[PDB]
Design a protein around this nucleic acid. Structure first.
Length: 157
RNA sequence: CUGCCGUAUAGGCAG
């Protein structure tokens, strides 16, 4: 694939903040960073997904070419948040893996979500997220400024 | 929370 790289960002446990809240913040900053960067070739997955308990889990995985990932990481988007994260190393994904879409799903759902604050409005909203069915190969779409699918697939492992 | 395509809170999207 063109997206054979990734990086895992682990939430460090914090007594004052449930993971879902750090994740929402993590995910928001990445969103700020992608709007900055500008492409549509960076995707995300939540590898510790718990479907049964509708939680996204303690990990955010970012997927990209070695080059898009370099750029994104050479940028102060986790400035203020580094302290709450444990970062892996950017790496070539293992293989083979199945692939899946990770997508926003809109309207109280049985789906994990992140709470965000829209930039214009001060309004908080809930962006619900579905990890689609596993398949064997990747179809050829891309991704949104949220790293979520507008056609594209991410290796799931 | 708000907004958009759409005849339609069919169904979709964007923040």
């Amino acid at each position: 694939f063109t997206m054979d790289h990734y990086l895992d960002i682990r939430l460090r446990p914090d007594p004052e903040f449930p993971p879902a809240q750090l994740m929402s913040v993590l995910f928001g900053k990445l969103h700020q960073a992608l709007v900055a960067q500008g492409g549509d070739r960076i995707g995300v997955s939540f590898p510790d997904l718990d479907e049964s308990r509708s939680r996204l889990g303690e990990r955010l995985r970012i997927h990209a070419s070695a080059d898009d990932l370099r750029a994104l990481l050479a940028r102060p988007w986790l400035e203020g948040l580094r302290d709450h994260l444990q970062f892996g190393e950017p790496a070539v994904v293992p293989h083979p893996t199945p692939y899946r879409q990770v997508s926003r799903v809109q309207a109280a759902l049985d789906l994990p979500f992140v709470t965000l604050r829209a930039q214009s409005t001060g309004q908080h909203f809930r962006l619900f997220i579905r990890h689609g069915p596993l398949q064997v190969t990747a179809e050829e779409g891309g991704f949104t400024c949220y790293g979520l699918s507008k056609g594209g697939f991410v290796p799931w492992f």
